[PDB]
Design a protein around this ligand. Structure first.
Ligand SMILES: O=C(O)CNC(=O)C(=O)O
Ligand SMILES: [Mg+2]
Ligand code: NI
Ligand SMILES: [Zn+2]
Length: 331
Protein backbone atom coordinates (compact mmCIF):
# COMPACT_ATOMS: atom_id res chain seq x y z
CA UNK A 1 0.00 0.00 0.00
CA UNK A 2 1.45 3.34 -1.06
CA UNK A 3 1.90 6.16 1.52
CA UNK A 4 0.70 4.11 4.50
CA UNK A 5 1.53 6.87 7.05
CA UNK A 6 -0.79 9.28 5.03
CA UNK A 7 1.84 12.01 4.60
CA UNK A 8 1.17 15.01 2.46
CA UNK A 9 2.93 14.50 -0.87
CA UNK A 10 4.40 17.20 -3.10
CA UNK A 11 4.51 16.77 -6.86
CA UNK A 12 6.61 18.44 -9.57
CA UNK A 13 5.02 17.54 -12.96
CA UNK A 14 6.91 18.28 -16.13
CA UNK A 15 5.28 20.40 -18.84
CA UNK A 16 4.35 17.20 -20.66
CA UNK A 17 2.81 15.65 -17.55
CA UNK A 18 0.81 18.92 -17.02
CA UNK A 19 -1.26 18.40 -20.16
CA UNK A 20 -3.71 15.83 -19.07
CA UNK A 21 -5.33 16.81 -15.73
CA UNK A 22 -7.30 13.61 -15.13
CA UNK A 23 -4.31 11.41 -15.91
CA UNK A 24 -2.09 13.29 -13.44
CA UNK A 25 -4.69 13.04 -10.61
CA UNK A 26 -4.86 9.33 -11.23
CA UNK A 27 -1.00 9.20 -11.17
CA UNK A 28 -0.87 11.00 -7.81
CA UNK A 29 -3.39 8.52 -6.42
CA UNK A 30 -1.26 5.58 -7.78
CA UNK A 31 1.48 6.91 -5.48
CA UNK A 32 -0.86 7.11 -2.45
CA UNK A 33 -1.39 10.89 -2.39
CA UNK A 34 -5.03 10.64 -1.47
CA UNK A 35 -4.32 8.85 1.74
CA UNK A 36 -3.20 12.23 3.27
CA UNK A 37 -6.39 14.03 2.23
CA UNK A 38 -4.30 16.82 0.62
CA UNK A 39 -1.46 17.11 -1.95
CA UNK A 40 0.62 20.00 -3.23
CA UNK A 41 1.36 20.41 -6.97
CA UNK A 42 4.17 22.77 -8.05
CA UNK A 43 3.56 23.70 -11.75
CA UNK A 44 6.45 23.36 -14.27
CA UNK A 45 8.59 26.40 -14.60
CA UNK A 46 7.27 26.99 -18.17
CA UNK A 47 3.69 27.52 -16.92
CA UNK A 48 1.82 30.62 -15.89
CA UNK A 49 -1.81 31.24 -14.88
CA UNK A 50 -1.95 34.64 -16.55
CA UNK A 51 0.49 37.40 -17.61
CA UNK A 52 0.18 39.78 -14.64
CA UNK A 53 -2.00 40.61 -11.61
CA UNK A 54 -1.70 44.39 -12.23
CA UNK A 55 -5.28 44.87 -13.36
CA UNK A 56 -7.46 43.15 -10.66
CA UNK A 57 -8.25 46.07 -8.37
CA UNK A 58 -11.66 46.76 -9.78
CA UNK A 59 -13.09 43.29 -9.08
CA UNK A 60 -15.98 43.74 -6.56
CA UNK A 61 -16.34 41.91 -3.30
CA UNK A 62 -20.11 42.39 -2.98
CA UNK A 63 -20.38 40.88 0.51
CA UNK A 64 -17.15 40.85 2.53
CA UNK A 65 -17.49 38.67 5.62
CA UNK A 66 -16.14 39.64 9.10
CA UNK A 67 -15.22 36.44 10.89
CA UNK A 68 -16.18 36.82 14.57
CA UNK A 69 -14.98 34.08 16.94
CA UNK A 70 -16.45 32.64 20.18
CA UNK A 71 -14.86 30.08 22.51
CA UNK A 72 -11.30 29.51 23.61
CA UNK A 73 -8.08 29.95 21.64
CA UNK A 74 -7.81 26.36 20.51
CA UNK A 75 -11.53 25.45 20.31
CA UNK A 76 -13.82 28.09 18.80
CA UNK A 77 -16.57 28.78 16.34
CA UNK A 78 -16.82 31.71 13.91
CA UNK A 79 -19.81 33.47 12.45
CA UNK A 80 -19.78 35.62 9.40
CA UNK A 81 -21.05 39.17 9.71
CA UNK A 82 -21.84 40.75 6.37
CA UNK A 83 -20.09 44.07 5.54
CA UNK A 84 -20.62 46.68 2.85
CA UNK A 85 -19.26 46.02 -0.65
CA UNK A 86 -15.77 46.96 -1.56
CA UNK A 87 -13.39 46.58 -4.48
CA UNK A 88 -10.28 44.36 -4.43
CA UNK A 89 -8.18 47.57 -4.33
CA UNK A 90 -10.09 48.80 -1.31
CA UNK A 91 -9.84 45.38 0.39
CA UNK A 92 -6.07 45.19 -0.25
CA UNK A 93 -5.60 48.58 1.43
CA UNK A 94 -7.68 47.40 4.37
CA UNK A 95 -5.69 44.16 4.70
CA UNK A 96 -2.42 46.25 4.76
CA UNK A 97 -3.73 48.71 7.43
CA UNK A 98 -2.30 48.72 10.91
CA UNK A 99 -5.52 47.13 12.31
CA UNK A 100 -5.35 44.07 9.96
CA UNK A 101 -1.80 43.64 8.71
CA UNK A 102 0.40 40.60 9.38
CA UNK A 103 2.59 41.19 12.49
CA UNK A 104 6.30 40.94 12.47
CA UNK A 105 7.40 37.34 12.65
CA UNK A 106 10.48 35.12 12.25
CA UNK A 107 9.21 32.37 10.04
CA UNK A 108 6.03 30.40 9.17
CA UNK A 109 6.19 28.47 12.46
CA UNK A 110 6.33 31.67 14.54
CA UNK A 111 3.37 33.06 12.59
CA UNK A 112 1.44 29.81 13.13
CA UNK A 113 2.05 30.15 16.91
CA UNK A 114 0.78 33.71 16.82
CA UNK A 115 -2.33 32.68 14.85
CA UNK A 116 -3.36 30.04 17.37
CA UNK A 117 -2.56 32.21 20.36
CA UNK A 118 -4.34 35.31 19.12
CA UNK A 119 -6.88 34.58 16.40
CA UNK A 120 -9.96 34.77 18.60
CA UNK A 121 -9.18 38.33 19.73
CA UNK A 122 -9.56 39.76 16.27
CA UNK A 123 -12.24 39.73 13.57
CA UNK A 124 -10.57 39.65 10.09
CA UNK A 125 -12.60 40.33 6.92
CA UNK A 126 -12.62 37.62 4.16
CA UNK A 127 -13.75 38.10 0.50
CA UNK A 128 -14.88 34.55 0.00
CA UNK A 129 -16.88 32.64 -2.42
CA UNK A 130 -16.88 35.14 -5.36
CA UNK A 131 -17.93 33.46 -8.66
CA UNK A 132 -15.23 34.10 -11.23
CA UNK A 133 -11.75 33.25 -12.56
CA UNK A 134 -8.27 34.80 -12.89
CA UNK A 135 -6.91 32.21 -15.34
CA UNK A 136 -6.23 33.60 -18.80
CA UNK A 137 -8.38 31.99 -21.46
CA UNK A 138 -5.27 31.06 -23.29
CA UNK A 139 -3.85 29.01 -20.39
CA UNK A 140 -4.62 25.46 -21.51
CA UNK A 141 -3.08 23.44 -18.65
CA UNK A 142 -4.66 23.31 -15.15
CA UNK A 143 -7.03 26.13 -15.94
CA UNK A 144 -9.66 25.83 -13.14
CA UNK A 145 -12.37 27.34 -15.36
CA UNK A 146 -11.85 24.63 -18.08
CA UNK A 147 -12.06 21.46 -16.11
CA UNK A 148 -14.40 18.55 -16.93
CA UNK A 149 -17.63 19.17 -15.02
CA UNK A 150 -18.97 17.03 -12.18
CA UNK A 151 -22.27 16.66 -14.04
CA UNK A 152 -20.44 15.23 -17.04
CA UNK A 153 -18.46 12.84 -14.77
CA UNK A 154 -21.68 11.56 -13.13
CA UNK A 155 -23.16 11.11 -16.58
CA UNK A 156 -20.11 9.27 -17.89
CA UNK A 157 -19.99 6.92 -14.87
CA UNK A 158 -23.61 6.27 -14.19
CA UNK A 159 -25.39 7.14 -17.49
CA UNK A 160 -27.82 9.70 -16.04
CA UNK A 161 -27.87 13.19 -17.52
CA UNK A 162 -28.48 15.89 -14.93
CA UNK A 163 -28.96 19.69 -14.70
CA UNK A 164 -26.36 21.92 -13.07
CA UNK A 165 -23.17 23.74 -13.64
CA UNK A 166 -19.71 23.78 -11.97
CA UNK A 167 -17.78 27.13 -11.96
CA UNK A 168 -14.80 28.45 -9.95
CA UNK A 169 -14.69 30.80 -7.02
CA UNK A 170 -12.25 33.52 -5.92
CA UNK A 171 -11.13 34.12 -2.31
CA UNK A 172 -9.49 37.35 -1.24
CA UNK A 173 -7.85 36.87 2.21
CA UNK A 174 -6.02 38.79 4.89
CA UNK A 175 -4.08 37.91 8.03
CA UNK A 176 -6.06 35.56 10.29
CA UNK A 177 -8.86 34.86 7.78
CA UNK A 178 -9.89 31.33 8.52
CA UNK A 179 -11.42 28.30 6.84
CA UNK A 180 -13.18 26.05 9.34
CA UNK A 181 -12.91 22.23 9.49
CA UNK A 182 -14.87 20.67 6.60
CA UNK A 183 -15.00 18.23 3.77
CA UNK A 184 -16.33 19.35 0.40
CA UNK A 185 -20.01 19.24 -0.61
CA UNK A 186 -20.90 15.60 -1.34
CA UNK A 187 -17.28 14.71 -0.29
CA UNK A 188 -16.01 15.95 -3.69
CA UNK A 189 -12.39 16.79 -4.50
CA UNK A 190 -11.30 20.40 -4.48
CA UNK A 191 -8.43 22.16 -6.24
CA UNK A 192 -7.12 25.52 -5.04
CA UNK A 193 -4.58 27.77 -6.83
CA UNK A 194 -2.94 30.57 -4.85
CA UNK A 195 -2.70 33.33 -7.52
CA UNK A 196 -0.86 35.96 -5.53
CA UNK A 197 0.16 37.34 -2.21
CA UNK A 198 0.88 35.80 1.14
CA UNK A 199 0.72 32.11 2.05
CA UNK A 200 -2.14 29.86 3.21
CA UNK A 201 -1.49 27.27 5.94
CA UNK A 202 -3.51 24.03 5.74
CA UNK A 203 -4.33 21.29 8.21
CA UNK A 204 -5.79 17.93 7.04
CA UNK A 205 -7.07 14.65 8.50
CA UNK A 206 -6.52 11.49 6.37
CA UNK A 207 -9.87 10.27 4.90
CA UNK A 208 -9.52 6.93 6.62
CA UNK A 209 -9.58 8.77 9.97
CA UNK A 210 -12.24 11.34 9.33
CA UNK A 211 -14.73 9.81 11.77
CA UNK A 212 -12.13 10.38 14.60
CA UNK A 213 -12.30 14.07 13.90
CA UNK A 214 -16.11 13.97 13.83
CA UNK A 215 -16.25 12.24 17.21
CA UNK A 216 -13.93 14.82 18.76
CA UNK A 217 -15.97 17.64 17.27
CA UNK A 218 -19.19 16.24 18.81
CA UNK A 219 -17.41 16.23 22.20
CA UNK A 220 -16.02 19.80 21.81
CA UNK A 221 -19.14 21.36 20.37
CA UNK A 222 -21.89 19.54 22.24
CA UNK A 223 -24.80 22.01 21.57
CA UNK A 224 -24.01 22.08 17.86
CA UNK A 225 -23.90 18.31 17.71
CA UNK A 226 -27.40 18.01 19.27
CA UNK A 227 -28.68 20.52 16.70
CA UNK A 228 -27.39 18.59 13.68
CA UNK A 229 -25.93 15.13 13.06
CA UNK A 230 -23.55 16.68 10.40
CA UNK A 231 -22.79 20.10 11.86
CA UNK A 232 -19.30 20.27 10.38
CA UNK A 233 -21.19 20.91 7.11
CA UNK A 234 -21.96 24.36 8.62
CA UNK A 235 -18.29 25.24 8.25
CA UNK A 236 -17.94 27.16 11.54
CA UNK A 237 -15.79 25.03 13.89
CA UNK A 238 -12.07 25.38 14.57
CA UNK A 239 -9.81 23.03 16.55
CA UNK A 240 -6.08 23.78 16.92
CA UNK A 241 -3.21 21.43 16.19
CA UNK A 242 -2.37 21.38 19.90
CA UNK A 243 -5.89 20.19 20.77
CA UNK A 244 -5.86 17.61 17.96
CA UNK A 245 -2.51 16.22 19.31
CA UNK A 246 -3.88 16.11 22.88
CA UNK A 247 -6.79 14.01 21.65
CA UNK A 248 -4.74 11.68 19.44
CA UNK A 249 -6.31 12.79 16.13
CA UNK A 250 -4.12 11.98 13.14
CA UNK A 251 -3.41 15.05 10.97
CA UNK A 252 -0.79 16.85 8.88
CA UNK A 253 0.01 20.45 8.04
CA UNK A 254 1.58 22.29 5.10
CA UNK A 255 1.93 25.89 3.88
CA UNK A 256 0.90 26.80 0.31
CA UNK A 257 2.69 29.69 -1.41
CA UNK A 258 1.77 31.81 -4.37
CA UNK A 259 2.00 29.86 -7.62
CA UNK A 260 1.19 26.50 -6.07
CA UNK A 261 -1.86 24.20 -6.34
CA UNK A 262 -3.40 22.19 -3.56
CA UNK A 263 -5.78 19.25 -4.14
CA UNK A 264 -8.10 17.98 -1.45
CA UNK A 265 -9.34 14.42 -1.80
CA UNK A 266 -12.81 12.95 -1.06
CA UNK A 267 -13.61 12.99 2.66
CA UNK A 268 -10.31 14.74 3.57
CA UNK A 269 -11.23 17.15 6.37
CA UNK A 270 -9.28 20.38 6.15
CA UNK A 271 -8.96 23.79 7.85
CA UNK A 272 -6.50 26.67 7.72
CA UNK A 273 -5.65 30.33 7.66
CA UNK A 274 -4.17 33.07 5.49
CA UNK A 275 -0.90 34.83 6.38
CA UNK A 276 -1.73 38.18 4.86
CA UNK A 277 -3.36 39.71 1.74
CA UNK A 278 -3.81 37.02 -0.93
CA UNK A 279 -6.05 35.75 -3.68
CA UNK A 280 -6.93 32.08 -4.32
CA UNK A 281 -9.19 30.36 -6.87
CA UNK A 282 -10.84 27.03 -6.15
CA UNK A 283 -13.38 24.61 -7.64
CA UNK A 284 -14.78 21.19 -6.86
CA UNK A 285 -14.24 18.24 -9.23
CA UNK A 286 -14.92 14.54 -9.44
CA UNK A 287 -13.24 11.37 -10.75
CA UNK A 288 -14.53 7.81 -10.99
CA UNK A 289 -13.17 7.09 -7.53
CA UNK A 290 -15.35 9.83 -6.03
CA UNK A 291 -18.67 8.13 -6.87
CA UNK A 292 -18.51 5.79 -3.87
CA UNK A 293 -17.77 8.70 -1.54
CA UNK A 294 -20.64 10.70 -2.95
CA UNK A 295 -23.06 7.87 -2.26
CA UNK A 296 -21.96 7.73 1.41
CA UNK A 297 -21.53 11.47 2.15
CA UNK A 298 -23.24 12.81 5.24
CA UNK A 299 -25.70 15.45 4.92
CA UNK A 300 -26.97 18.46 6.96
CA UNK A 301 -30.77 18.59 6.86
CA UNK A 302 -31.23 21.15 9.77
CA UNK A 303 -31.28 24.18 7.48
CA UNK A 304 -27.93 25.65 8.29
CA UNK A 305 -25.67 24.38 5.52
CA UNK A 306 -27.66 25.80 2.49
CA UNK A 307 -25.75 25.09 -0.78
CA UNK A 308 -25.68 25.52 -4.51
CA UNK A 309 -28.30 24.62 -7.00
CA UNK A 310 -26.15 21.86 -8.45
CA UNK A 311 -26.10 19.72 -5.26
CA UNK A 312 -29.73 18.84 -5.75
CA UNK A 313 -29.07 16.36 -8.54
CA UNK A 314 -26.14 14.75 -6.72
CA UNK A 315 -28.36 13.97 -3.68
CA UNK A 316 -31.31 12.99 -5.83
CA UNK A 317 -29.37 10.43 -7.93
CA UNK A 318 -26.72 9.19 -5.47
CA UNK A 319 -28.77 9.33 -2.22
CA UNK A 320 -32.47 8.92 -3.09
CA UNK A 321 -33.39 7.70 0.41
CA UNK A 322 -32.02 10.94 1.94
CA UNK A 323 -33.34 13.28 -0.73
CA UNK A 324 -36.73 14.26 0.71
CA UNK A 325 -35.27 15.10 4.17
CA UNK A 326 -32.29 17.00 2.73
CA UNK A 327 -34.50 19.04 0.37
CA UNK A 328 -36.75 20.07 3.33
CA UNK A 329 -33.52 21.44 4.92
CA UNK A 330 -32.91 23.39 1.72
CA UNK A 331 -36.51 24.89 1.96
O1 LIG B 1 -9.08 28.90 0.72
C1 LIG B 1 -10.09 28.77 1.49
O2 LIG B 1 -10.57 29.71 2.22
C2 LIG B 1 -10.84 27.50 1.65
N1 LIG B 1 -10.56 26.59 0.50
C3 LIG B 1 -10.91 25.35 0.50
O3 LIG B 1 -11.55 24.79 1.51
C4 LIG B 1 -10.64 24.48 -0.67
O4 LIG B 1 -10.00 24.91 -1.63
O5 LIG B 1 -11.16 23.33 -0.60
MG1 LIG C 1 -10.06 44.92 -12.08
NI1 NI D 1 -12.42 23.02 1.09
ZN1 LIG E 1 -27.07 21.18 9.97
Amino acid sequence: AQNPNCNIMIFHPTKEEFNDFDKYIAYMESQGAHRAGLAKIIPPKEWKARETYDNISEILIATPLQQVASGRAGVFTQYHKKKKAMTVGEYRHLANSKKYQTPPHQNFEDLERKYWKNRIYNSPIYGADISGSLFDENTKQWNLGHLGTIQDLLEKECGVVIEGVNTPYLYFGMWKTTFAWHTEDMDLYSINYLHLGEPKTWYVVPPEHGQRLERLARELFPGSSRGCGAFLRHKVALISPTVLKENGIPFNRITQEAGEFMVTFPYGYHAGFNHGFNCAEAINFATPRWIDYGKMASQCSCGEARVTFSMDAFVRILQPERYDLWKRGQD
